[PDB]
Design a protein around this nucleic acid. Structure first.
Lengths: 71, 176, 38
RNA sequence: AGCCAGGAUGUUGGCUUAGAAGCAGCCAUCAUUUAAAGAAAGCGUAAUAGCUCACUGGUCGAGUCGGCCUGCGCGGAAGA
């Protein structure tokens, strides 16, 4: 099966923890396309097929992880 | 002190009579009792009471609430009394108290054999519990607390007599 | 253990009492918590 | 002040050791039901249980409290 969105974000972002030691450890950035592969984890619990909506919970999960929504 | 103004409400088997000086009490568990009001002012309205100072005196509350607490125990003491469990759970302990005499096995050279003050009676219908009979809340507590001074509970084994509630703060030997 | 002139720190289980105008520190769970001055 | 009902939920937030049981590093400090209970202060044991904040609500019911200055006492205080 597929894992939770949080670890599926760590597989896509330049993060090795955690935010680690400031200016020494990294978190990287994730693109709108890279977010929309992770939003598919909602497509059978969310009743609406709207891709924007199912990605809002991933953009919220990214803030819950300090992960950067940047192109 | 709002409690000094709280009504008490005299229970069954008790009779109260009042004057500008001295209060008079009769009761089915006690004896004809009078208390002098040398520092306090007291009123009694057939079954319900109130206490205060007879002249101020700063803040007025210094004696009246104490005199009221005493009365609010006395009107129970002279009809039904107070709780009467003084208990043993230690190994080799035995109660044998009777009349005015305390006979007790507690790990000492003698079985106490103490003769008690006045106004107090003791029994133990079971070998594990001492039952004190009396109408005065002060003597019934003071005799059980003066008995607490005979082999005081030791710091790491904590054994002795308990007032039906365990309070001893018994230590554990150094760690380990 | 000493009489210790300053009272500065307690625990919620420490009662603290005034006797002859002077404060004393006393706690049912901590036999070390004893002061007699102030 | 006392007596007394609730200290709940998302949620095992996530990484992690050893249990985590509020009470252990560092990262996320947001959300909900409601009259109302923090991603809660604190103790407690190696761990627990237990104690204990926070907020609302039930009952009596009128005044009550903590500092900062000042006059005066209180102890602090031991010698031939």
């Amino acid at each position: 099966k597929t894992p939770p969105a949080a670890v599926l974000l760590k597989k896509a972002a330049g993060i090795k923890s955690g935010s680690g030691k400031p200016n020494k450890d990294k978190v990287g950035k994730i693109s709108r396309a890279q977010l929309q592969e992770i939003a598919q984890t909602k497509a059978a619990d969310m009743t609406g097929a709207d891709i924007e909506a199912m990605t809002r919970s991933i953009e919220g999960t990214a803030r819950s992880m300090g992960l950067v929504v940047e192109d | 002190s709002r409690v000094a103004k709280a009504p008490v409400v005299v229970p069954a088997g008790v009779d109260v009579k009042i004057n500008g000086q001295v209060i008079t009490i009769k009761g089915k568990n006690g004896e004809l009792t009078r208390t002098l009001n040398d520092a306090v002012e007291v009123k009694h309205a057939d079954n319900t009471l109130t206490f205060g100072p007879r002249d101020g005196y700063a803040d007025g509350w210094a004696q009246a609430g104490t005199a009221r607490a005493l009365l609010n125990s006395m009107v129970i003491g002279v009809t039904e009394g107070f709780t009467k469990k003084l208990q043993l759970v230690g190994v080799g302990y035995r109660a044998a108290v009777k009349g005015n005499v305390i006979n007790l096995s507690l790990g000492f050279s003698h079985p106490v054999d103490h003769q008690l003050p006045a106004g107090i009676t003791a029994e133990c219908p079971t070998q594990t519990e001492i039952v004190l009979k009396g109408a005065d809340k002060q003597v019934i507590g003071q005799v059980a607390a003066d008995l607490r001074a005979y082999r005081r509970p030791e710091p790491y084994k904590g054994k002795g007599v308990r007032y039906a509630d365990e309070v001893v703060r018994t230590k554990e030997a150094k760690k380990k | 253990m000493k009489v210790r002139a300053s009272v500065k720190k307690l625990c919620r289980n420490c009662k603290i009492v005034k006797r002859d105008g002077v404060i004393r520190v006393i706690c049912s769970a901590e036999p070390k918590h004893k002061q007699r001055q102030g």
